[PDB]
Structure 1
Amino acid sequence: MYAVYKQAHPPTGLEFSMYCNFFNNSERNLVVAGTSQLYVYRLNREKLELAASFSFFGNVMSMASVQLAGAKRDALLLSFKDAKLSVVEYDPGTHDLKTLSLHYFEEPELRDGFVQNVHTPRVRVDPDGRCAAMLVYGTRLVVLPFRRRSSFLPSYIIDVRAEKLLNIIDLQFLHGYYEPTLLILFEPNQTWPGRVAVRQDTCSIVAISLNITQKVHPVIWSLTSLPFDCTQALAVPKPIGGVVVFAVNSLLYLNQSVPPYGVALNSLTTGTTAFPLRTQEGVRITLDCAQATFISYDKMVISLKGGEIYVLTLITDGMRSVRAFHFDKAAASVLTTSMVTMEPGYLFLGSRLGNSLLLKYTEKLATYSFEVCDSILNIGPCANAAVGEPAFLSEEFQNSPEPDLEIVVCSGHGKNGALSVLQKSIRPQVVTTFELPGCYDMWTVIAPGRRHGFLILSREDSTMILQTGQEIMELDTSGFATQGPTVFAGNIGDNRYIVQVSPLGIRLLEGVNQLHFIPVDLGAPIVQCAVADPYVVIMSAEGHVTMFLLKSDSYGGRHHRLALHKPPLHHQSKVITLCLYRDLSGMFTTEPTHWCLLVRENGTMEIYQLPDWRLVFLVKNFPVGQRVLVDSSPLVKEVLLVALGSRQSRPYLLVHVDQELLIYEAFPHDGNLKVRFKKVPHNINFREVARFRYFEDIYGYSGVFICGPSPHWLLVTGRGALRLHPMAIDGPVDSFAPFHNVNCPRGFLYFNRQGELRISVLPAYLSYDAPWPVRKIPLRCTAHYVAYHVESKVYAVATSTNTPCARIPRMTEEKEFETIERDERYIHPQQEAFSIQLISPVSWEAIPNARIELQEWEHVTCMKTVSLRSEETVSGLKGYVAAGTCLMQGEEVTCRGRILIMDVIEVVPPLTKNKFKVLYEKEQKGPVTALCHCNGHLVSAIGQKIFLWSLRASELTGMAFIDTQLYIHQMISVKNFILAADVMKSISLLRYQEESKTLSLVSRDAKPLEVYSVDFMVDNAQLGFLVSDRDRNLMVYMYLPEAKESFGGMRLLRRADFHVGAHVNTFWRTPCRENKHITWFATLDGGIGLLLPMQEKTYRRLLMLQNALTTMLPHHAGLNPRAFRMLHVNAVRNVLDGELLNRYLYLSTMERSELAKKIGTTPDIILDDLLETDRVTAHF
């Protein structure tokens, strides 16, 4: 059973934040990493623009920066799983990431016999920049020295067990030492809170002076008996030059010169630490799972576990000795996983549990107010996902053969909990539709803040002019060129004058009356026309180019007319197409400049500056599609060079070659034009007059609409991130234009292939500046589960809030509650209160009086949409929302369950239309851990059993039960069968027989496996069981009674595996664009992937291609995708990467041809397979 993996949505959970000189030593910028993605952001003066982004075949475990001896740029140190370490650096010649070095430290002798590593590779860099260190396996401290040929000295490994250095909590390089001094916070005799009465004060710190020349590392100073709950250590910069140790309930300042200074932060420090700790009066918090960065030498900001942002100031003498600590509850923000200071007054909080935030802090012994400047969207972690139909869809698209689908995800956590409504495709909100026969091309022109005045349509024999106002009315009387076709229509003179180019010449008019008309006869009719205010260029079918200029009158009266200016751009190579570009940015240099990009018959491409017509750029082989366009000294059908982003910041070059689309991002490099172009990867398929239609301010968004068989939207906002959103709910679009009207405020109009012109707008409430169009519904509470009720089109969302824990249940004697009595400084435990809300997709609001509050200490362990047997439906079944809850009173009390069946019923009302009705609500003997449906029956795991009930009226009648494993946390059923997932004992396949009323264990997998979630792989005439585990893997098992690999059909057999690199908790299946089902899933890092079952022969072909791609292509950080996709952290493979297969589309035509030659196949065969896999997965 073979399949291909595809990444439909990249992860959005960030983990590391850094501030360094990535591009050059002049400007510093932000570098943020999340799992397999790395981003370089610049700051606008308030927005972060994505300056660069790179993907890895590996998960970044640690990130750091260093300034090497050459000092061209900063080098980046990236840790990867087990013991891989990569030094990388920006390549100015290719706008890419160049691998300086890659080091493997994966040897079993370094693991001391252990096979399971619970330690991540932790990298630290000495502040002076003389060496780096990486703690691996918690046992081996790798030291990479730096020169003060190769820029790196040979590394050497220090065995920390040479003292009794064990269980290292943290390590950090220190400031102010002449040798790299590394402080290590650890604990020789490990302890845990329950055993704190026997072992406490177990932590210790040891500072190591590293001499890299002699490889000598003595201990300069050490401290023992530090509080057991020490969490991390922060190096204090000059001139204070100490170490600040965080501990769950305490704060320490340590240094060689002064005895330690310890401060208790709450009451819980009493009886747990014998360390002398003075009490901080106005503070009552904890520092566990907190982040902190120095904003200056004297103050550092701390983001706590709950999002509280405090500012800590160090009080010093004249000789800089920390006398006291000063905290100040500055503000409250997101749950930060990372944090870094940028320019003075700016602080970045990176988060994977919420949207990352840029903050600006301003002062007013001195307090600081924090203000949110920018945010980076994040749909992770994706705890649970449901698929439903959107509430609003334009009538013209209803009754479509394909279903209109929409994803609703439980995203985030805690105060940053939310629902993410994802749609991949753009839906046009059609205001109205005109059916106009004969029109094949269109233009929209502003009449004389900017509202379009005229819509000019062209037809083989004529043209049509439409006045645009309160009504759109045909204009026959105007002085336009109504007779004959129109090849172009645009605006000149900053939207004061309008221009209409016809095959016989050019016409300059103002409003409805024409001011000027120049006949243009060059031996061939005019076939193309470009306009870059105030320059106009036209070209004929033979290849004659002409330029006109809009010149103001000498008396300043602003009367304008076109002036001929013949270009001296003669060449022996015939021009195919061209385009004009008005640069308001500063990239195009040799401040508004004018350029002409031109393609010729010999295959070359040229750029000329205007009006002197001077050559400044030349590419010898343009239609090949090289990955980097380099200056020197297949049918290129269309070309367009446009500026997008904030204030025309980023330039892009779109090229339409035969059945191929090319996107090029322009970047500065080095008489000649100091610009280069880098290819942008995409999956837009051109295979089946101007296909590229630029637009500005279509909904506050600037970009380009790409017409063709699969239309797309290309968007770049103030953030320099390219967005490619499909629009395929309507067929192939051949004509597009922007349109700002009083009835179509900031909108567009497009022609379909059935002759329908659609005046539409973009749907509001959706952010299109994201990988997928997304609507974020903040819940301010953890979203645990989401279910879609088909009959009512409403979502049931199970959420929770945190309250202070006040009582302790003591006996499962009789039920008794001890009231927790403490003092004011005590920090109460967090007690979860669960609720079930109804939310309507119409307004994405909660339905009033439709909220179910569950009992105290009652946790909702599962919530699914179930189809139970009912006699009121034609199908014999109807949908309910089923929930299983467990009342957890601690370990000493028996955990009793409860089943809760609800229905969403229609009631005479907007949001009042629907209401919750509790059809069933009964406490169960044993904890209710999972539930699903099977042939109209409700299957639920209770304790160590699984019961199958039938619902009749309002009562649940027990029909079957079976003994199961330790704890079943997930259950899903294909008709007649059931699949249950244990916490530790993998999956189990059961059968229910209606004749016997019995459950029979069909088979299972005896091997232990920490299953996260499970679902099905539905290939044609095949059934597989898809499992995710704790090691970020996917495995397809199968029940093959005749395979003999099973002892007697009782052993489930693994037939596919794949290291996705993320934890998957929610799957869902969709039909194929057969009998195949694409099994999509959402990851806990904010990403969406899919598994697509595939034929064996196509799998073999693409596997040969995959080996070719892994062996013949360079990969970031020097990693290798074959080893990245391997099992654990045995294997049968049978799952293609897809992310790796996409790079073949990124190769040039020559590279693709040579690669297919080495494989033994046709480039067209490879492209057919890849584009078909892309076509089948088009959903949402």
Structure 2
Amino acid sequence: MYAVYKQAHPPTGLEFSMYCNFFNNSERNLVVAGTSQLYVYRLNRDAEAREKLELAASFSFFGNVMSMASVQLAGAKRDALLLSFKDAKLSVVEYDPGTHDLKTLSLHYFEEPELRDGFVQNVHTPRVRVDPDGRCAAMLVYGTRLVVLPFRSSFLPSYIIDVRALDEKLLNIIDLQFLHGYYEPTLLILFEPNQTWPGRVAVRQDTCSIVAISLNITQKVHPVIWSLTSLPFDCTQALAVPKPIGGVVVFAVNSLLYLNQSVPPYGVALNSLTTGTTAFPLRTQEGVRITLDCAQATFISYDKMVISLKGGEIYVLTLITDGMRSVRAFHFDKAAASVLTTSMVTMEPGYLFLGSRLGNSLLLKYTEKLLATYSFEVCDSILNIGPCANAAVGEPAFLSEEFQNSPEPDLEIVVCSGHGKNGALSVLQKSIRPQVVTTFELPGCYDMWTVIAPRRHGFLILSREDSTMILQTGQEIMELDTSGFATQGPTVFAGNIGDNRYIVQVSPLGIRLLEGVNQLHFIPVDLGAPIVQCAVADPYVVIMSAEGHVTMFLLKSDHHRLALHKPPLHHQSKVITLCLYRDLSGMFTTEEPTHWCLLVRENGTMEIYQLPDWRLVFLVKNFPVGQRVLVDSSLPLVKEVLLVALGSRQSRPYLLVHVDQELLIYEAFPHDSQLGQGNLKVRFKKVPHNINFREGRVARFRYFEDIYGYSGVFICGPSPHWLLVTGRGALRLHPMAIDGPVDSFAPFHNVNCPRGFLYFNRQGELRISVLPAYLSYDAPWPVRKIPLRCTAHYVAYHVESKVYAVATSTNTPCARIPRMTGEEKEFETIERDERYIHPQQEAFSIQLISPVSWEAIPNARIELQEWEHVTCMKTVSLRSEETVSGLKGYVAAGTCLMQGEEVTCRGRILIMDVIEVVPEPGQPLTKNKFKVLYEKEQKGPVTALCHCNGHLVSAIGQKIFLWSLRASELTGMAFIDTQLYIHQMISVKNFILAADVMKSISLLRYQEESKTLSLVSRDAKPLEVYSVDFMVDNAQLGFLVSDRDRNLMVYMYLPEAKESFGGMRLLRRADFHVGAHVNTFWRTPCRVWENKHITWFATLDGGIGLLLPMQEKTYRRLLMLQNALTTMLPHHAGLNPRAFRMLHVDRRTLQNAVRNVLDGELLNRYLYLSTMERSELAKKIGTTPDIILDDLLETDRVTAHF
């Protein structure tokens, strides 16, 4: 009944983009957005690994963005954003300095029942448009209201303009744009007064029109000027031509118009489909046969427009200008094709960003060729797990032999991402699994270091409780017994000084210098007590004893030699831990490398000193609490502190600290605060986690540089994680849960081992390990993107032979039309003009992908008929009397022929087996091959397929059959009559759960003694189901349903309840609203959680979520927290988390919402609060923070799969 939603992978895929002064008026910024998440970019020119987009800020929302614009307000130092959320919500946000968050300036709530005009089912999205001059801003609420925001507080009170109360009775708004010049804000509006449909054009030829309303901000009056009424019927978006020419260009599907107030209407036709469907005067464009129906465009300078068509093809329109700035003709050219975009923005002049949902959103660069013709090259691309259609769970092929006897199953997910030309597969895999190439058994030793001796690592320095081991590395690693190092006792640190020219180890008595094996000299160090840890800079070595005494050593070139320099440090309290840091891309400017020291004291004060001197530069007075933003001012116990620079050329520093079995890490951002002379111009911002530290010093925070190119920090402990920042600048935390807890870590570059690492097992085992090279660790999950260049529909892992069967599709031009004369089919060849685009016919094929190398297996491809479309593919466990069990595990495909609505659609069931045969010499992958057993036409379209105890269950038409696989044929056993179109089925233990497109789910049941199939229960309410799952509890079995209104809901079959009939009605017991559509569903058991399963799913906007079932008592301790987190915390864009996660029925029926799912991304903000603020929310709901953290962190431990 009770559950918790949790988000595993963020949504990838962009819908919105712009180019605005987000941080400051000095530079512009690419601010892109998508499904409920906002990304802000910079553009690096001198990037190591050529231009590259660098992430500057990432922002998450409790609501899906429906439009986005920007305007620079009067007296503002930045460029505010105008976000727009579903059913008439506006929010004006700026970037906030000081902190590093967003700041809401204005909130606008325009959803009242008198504005909906009686229409409950809203279709029209709110559309924010702003002025080119910044005078006002307009939102199209509900398609019949214009909200006008006046500009100069920075805002004037808004006023709603009724669209249908104007002249010309607008009533169906297509697109609306503000125009240039025209002294007052002028708003052009495309509309249709008498709407028609393409398909009914013989009685309504061309009905589109234009109103250029002129807004008076003060007087609140607005007259209609410059109306046209004879535009073609299929007019999509309009675009405002800039100021030196002025006017508007209007995209239609088959034509392109330039319209201006004084100029006569000019427009050309793009293909010969405006012959009998358009009476507007259109000329014929020369050498151009395309269409503009779903096309994005932007203006480069003035008179040049770049258009991204469907198919991804890029054209550049040139407005041929006369002497009086009047557009005379058009000019097209076919430039290089690109991704199927959803957005289009010019950056710095010479660049185009191309946002896309389906495909990798990439940045371009245009130069002129030597009229002007441009050439486009690709600079950077952003990785995109696309519109996840179907997704199968499988086992990877390269698990190392040391990790084979692990108790938990080792598995990954393969996702059908993208569409069309950008169709692909995505091999997602959450945790990092190393390749142990050489293991050891070295007990007793706990710490470890690798130094560079004459960039390969030369030595391996192992510290024991009484001695110290040395390993000479090279062609074959071998333990060293000669002089040099101190092996009579332990070592607390061992690293390089200078620039990889020396080796410095620290004993608890002193410090030795080393040119490799040869010891240079030795400096004993009493320093009160024995040395507990040391940190290293390039000339600096800073020592800390057990009683807080700090000394510093410095290289002086004499030949080099460490020199004692005692620091002047006013010890009002004892120093607990230390850290050193150098600048290589300096934001530590404090009003060429620069060295810095970090020093945590026992009173809770954190101090940064500029390291050549010892002056105090930065001071946080209450540090171990875990505040969100660290601000200078000049307990839980702080264990370990590490400052590290990560990214392109060591750009951005991070602060990683350890406070009472809790990891809390910080970013760093510049901040010019005029409140002193000698202070750092930086502040630190806490960033969220999924990592807990819940089970003479061992460092957990161990910085690595260049392990497989990637640089970052490995965080040791009971739950080891990889911290990674590449040149993207995006923070990446990847777990490593195999091989248990990890005690120590070191990078290790050798000959027999490539760029790689080296770590201790908890059982005392040294492991030479290399990261596996087929994944990309720059994405939020480690993923390999597999380009298919065709739309992947279904994927199914076949357990025998260990392969994937992928259903693909490519677009071919259609050439025939099926007819029906009563007895047989007749085909009419489409014979048209030469200036004619063809409709796209889809031809399907079934691939066979191998997990070893992810290429397709050659000569293994089932190709279907001409008009035949796979509607489902699942791995089907049919029964057989051959193996030791009953079940076999074939692959069945349900497919049928789409030939229009006047031809009877029939289907075919395609049952396939993958059998290992002998491979052809020269190709190792050709050992696998399909064997089609069953291929027979059915009596109607095959729309869903499943298995019940070895019986193939199929949905042909308005019936659901249940077949039995014989030696060669299927025999029918049972059937029922069902709903309109069963497009999904699932099954558990002779209980079928079907799903209709329009009506609802309907569970079935099959007795095996009597060959009968029976409807047990169903839902009578109408519901547009996408796909179905089973919520599995200890003894409860829920029926998880995803919907068209982005809703998750859980039905149960409860005959004891009175609000149903007697076993004849399904009763929903949980309601929830994910922000995206869901087609895929997975189950796996978790890592009190004795017999439950986790219903994983992948959203259709590119994310992955969870639903973890819980007890009733654990639900209600956290529901008291969720209501406290909703009200008592500020949210981005003023959005309400309760209002976003409630059910979104766009009707009214008798079904009051049963909310039994927690918001685990709202509950994830309780982990983000400081421990002073963490206890205030516990005292107000009558609990302690130890009880809540034993509930929020246990939902992260059992949900650490993949």
Give the TM-score, by structure 2 length.
0.97
1:1019-1058 deviation line (CA, Å, top 9, x unaligned): 1100010000000110000111111211222111010010
Q: Where does residue 493 of structure 2 map in the other structure?
A: 488
The 3-state SS of whatever aligns with 1:329 is coil
Q: CA deviation at 1:320?
A: 1.1
Counterparts of 2:653 and 2:839, CA distance in 1? 54
Higher alpha-carbon deviation: 777-786 or 565-574: 565-574
1:621-656 deviation line (CA, Å, top 9, x unaligned): 111000111100111000000000010011000001
1:390-440 deviation line (CA, Å, top 9, x unaligned): 011011100210000100000000000000000000001111111112111
Counterparts of 1:701 and 1:522, CA distance in 2? 38
Q: CA deviation at 1:806?
A: 0.0
Q: CA deviation at 1:816?
A: 0.1
Q: CA deviation at 1:1075?
A: 1.2
Q: Where does residue 260 of structure 1 map in the other structure?
A: 265
Q: CA deviation at 1:748?
A: 0.1
Q: Where does residue 811 of structure 2 map in the other structure?
A: 802
Q: Alignment partner for residue 743 of structure 2, among 729, 734, 740?
A: 734
Counterparts of 1:171 and 1:709, CA distance in 2? 57
Q: Alignment partner for residue 1140 of structure 2, among 1112, 1124, 1127?
A: 1124
The 3-state SS of whatever aligns with 1:1024 is strand
Counterparts of 1:801 and 1:478, CA distance in 2? 69
Q: Where does residue 769 of structure 2 map in the other structure?
A: 760
Counterparts of 1:232 and 1:200, CA distance in 2? 19
Counterparts of 1:487 and 1:843, CA distance in 2? 44
Q: Where does residue 823 of structure 1 map in the other structure?
A: 833
The 3-state SS of whatever aligns with 1:797 is strand
The 3-state SS of whatever aligns with 1:1146 is coil
1:193-217 deviation line (CA, Å, top 9, x unaligned): 1111111211111101101100111
Q: CA deviation at 1:884?
A: 0.6
Counterparts of 1:258 and 1:926, CA distance in 2? 58
The 3-state SS of whatever aligns with 1:194 is coil
The 3-state SS of whatever aligns with 1:103 is strand
Q: CA deviation at 1:319?
A: 1.6
Counterparts of 1:228 and 1:970, CA distance in 2? 38
Q: CA deviation at 1:675?
A: 0.6
The 3-state SS of whatever aligns with 2:292 is coil
Counterparts of 1:1177 and 1:492, CA distance in 2? 43
The 3-state SS of whatever aligns with 1:184 is strand
Counterparts of 1:495 and 1:282, CA distance in 2? 64
1:467-521 deviation line (CA, Å, top 9, x unaligned): 1111111111141112211110111111111101110011111111011211111
Q: Where does residue 556 of structure 1 map in the other structure?
A: none
Counterparts of 1:416 and 1:784, CA distance in 2? 13
Q: Where does residue 1149 of structure 2 map in the other structure?
A: none
Q: Where does residue 936 of structure 2 map in the other structure?
A: 922
Counterparts of 2:326 and 2:450, CA distance in 1? 71
Counterparts of 1:88 and 1:610, CA distance in 2? 40
Counterparts of 2:570 and 2:437, CA distance in 1? 49
Q: CA deviation at 1:298?
A: 1.6
Q: CA deviation at 1:1143?
A: 0.2
Indicate conservation of the 8 Å contact 2:366/2:375, yes or no. Answer: yes
The 3-state SS of whatever aligns with 1:868 is coil
Q: Where does residue 564 of structure 2 map in the other structure?
A: 564
Q: CA deviation at 1:466?
A: 1.1
Counterparts of 2:1113 and 2:180, CA distance in 1? 60
1:215-242 deviation line (CA, Å, top 9, x unaligned): 1111121111101000100111110111
Q: CA deviation at 1:814?
A: 2.2
Indicate conservation of the 8 Å contact 2:759/2:767, yes or no. Answer: yes
Counterparts of 1:214 and 1:344, CA distance in 2? 39
Counterparts of 1:100 and 1:525, CA distance in 2? 56
Runs (4+) of structure 1 exceeding 2 A deviation are: none
1:279-306 deviation line (CA, Å, top 9, x unaligned): 1111111111110011111211111011
Query: Would you say how many aligned residue pairs link Structure 1 and Structure 2?
Result: 1171
Counterparts of 2:1187 and 2:576, CA distance in 1? 29
1:885-910 deviation line (CA, Å, top 9, x unaligned): 111110000001111000001101x2
Give the superposed CA RMSD.
0.9
Counterparts of 1:525 and 1:177, CA distance in 2? 79
Q: Alignment partner for residue 672 of structure 1, among 666, 675, 679?
A: 679
Q: Where does residue 1056 of structure 1 map in the other structure?
A: 1070
1:775-808 deviation line (CA, Å, top 9, x unaligned): 0000000000000101111000011110000000
Higher alpha-carbon deviation: 41-50 or 645-654: 41-50
| Alignment partner of 1:1134 is 2:1134 | no
Counterparts of 1:478 and 1:898, CA distance in 2? 79
Indicate conservation of the 8 Å contact 2:319/2:330, yes or no. Answer: yes
Counterparts of 1:1161 and 1:875, CA distance in 2? 52
Q: CA deviation at 1:1062?
A: 0.4
The 3-state SS of whatever aligns with 2:345 is strand
Indicate conservation of the 8 Å contact 2:1055/2:1061, yes or no. Answer: no
Give the TM-score, by structure 1 length.
0.99
The 3-state SS of whatever aligns with 1:869 is coil
1:56-86 deviation line (CA, Å, top 9, x unaligned): 0000000111100122111000000101100
Counterparts of 2:513 and 2:225, CA distance in 1? 83
1:952-991 deviation line (CA, Å, top 9, x unaligned): 0110111111111110100001111101100100100111
Indicate conservation of the 8 Å contact 2:541/2:552, yes or no. Answer: yes
Counterparts of 1:1092 and 1:274, CA distance in 2? 60
Counterparts of 2:1049 and 2:813, CA distance in 1? 41
Counterparts of 2:286 and 2:834, CA distance in 1? 11
Counterparts of 2:1121 and 2:213, CA distance in 1? 50
Counterparts of 2:224 and 2:557, CA distance in 1? 80
Q: CA deviation at 1:39?
A: 0.3
The 3-state SS of whatever aligns with 2:1030 is strand
Q: CA deviation at 1:177?
A: 1.8
The 3-state SS of whatever aligns with 2:173 is coil
Counterparts of 1:329 and 1:99, CA distance in 2? 44
Indicate conservation of the 8 Å contact 2:994/2:1003, yes or no. Answer: yes
Counterparts of 1:912 and 1:285, CA distance in 2? 42
Counterparts of 2:723 and 2:397, CA distance in 1? 26
Indicate conservation of the 8 Å contact 2:307/2:315, yes or no. Answer: yes
Counterparts of 2:210 and 2:1182, CA distance in 1? 61
Counterparts of 2:809 and 2:18, CA distance in 1? 33
Counterparts of 2:335 and 2:764, CA distance in 1? 60
Counterparts of 1:524 and 1:29, CA distance in 2? 53
Counterparts of 2:1000 and 2:426, CA distance in 1? 30
1:158-217 deviation line (CA, Å, top 9, x unaligned): 001021101100001111121011110010000011111111211111101101100111
Counterparts of 2:346 and 2:713, CA distance in 1? 36
Unaligned residue ranges in structure 1 (runs of 5+)? 554-558
Q: CA deviation at 1:339?
A: 1.2
Counterparts of 2:723 and 2:968, CA distance in 1? 53
Counterparts of 1:789 and 1:850, CA distance in 2? 14
1:1040-1088 deviation line (CA, Å, top 9, x unaligned): 1111211222111010010001000010101111110100001111100
The 3-state SS of whatever aligns with 1:580 is strand
Indicate conservation of the 8 Å contact 2:671/2:682, yes or no. Answer: yes
Counterparts of 1:592 and 1:349, CA distance in 2? 37
Q: CA deviation at 1:925?
A: 1.2
Q: CA deviation at 1:824?
A: 1.2
1:987-1029 deviation line (CA, Å, top 9, x unaligned): 0011111122111110110100010111100011000100000
Greater strand fraction, Structure 1 or Structure 2: 1
1:120-152 deviation line (CA, Å, top 9, x unaligned): 010000110011000011000000011xx9101
1:595-627 deviation line (CA, Å, top 9, x unaligned): 001000111000000211111000011110001
Higher alpha-carbon deviation: 777-786 or 865-874: 865-874
Counterparts of 2:425 and 2:238, CA distance in 1? 36
Indicate conservation of the 8 Å contact 2:1040/2:1049, yes or no. Answer: yes
The 3-state SS of whatever aligns with 1:92 is coil
Counterparts of 1:494 and 1:205, CA distance in 2? 70
Higher alpha-carbon deviation: 918-927 or 807-816: 807-816
The 3-state SS of whatever aligns with 1:439 is coil
